[PDB]
Amino acid sequence: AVPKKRTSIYKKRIRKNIWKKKGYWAALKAFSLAKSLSTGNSKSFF
Template sequence: MAVPKKRTSISKKSIRKNFWKRKGYWAALKAFSLAKSLSTGNSNFCTKNK
């Protein structure tokens, strides 16, 4: 017979949520940095054809 699980504490839930948000923040920061370097032409990622 199935037994209900115990409730996750608020602090544990907020720690997981903050970790998840932080990962998104760093991904957005890297994407913005790459876009900025591509627009200025200082990127090693790809070269523009002139």
């Protein structure tokens, strides 16, 4: 239940990178929502 030994810098950088990157993928979605919200026919955002 209790960890044996601290992880390296190596591994941790790997996972933090996966975290942030997991944030990377979820921008270009918001950028599509932006580039579509620039005035255009649509039924959303009253």
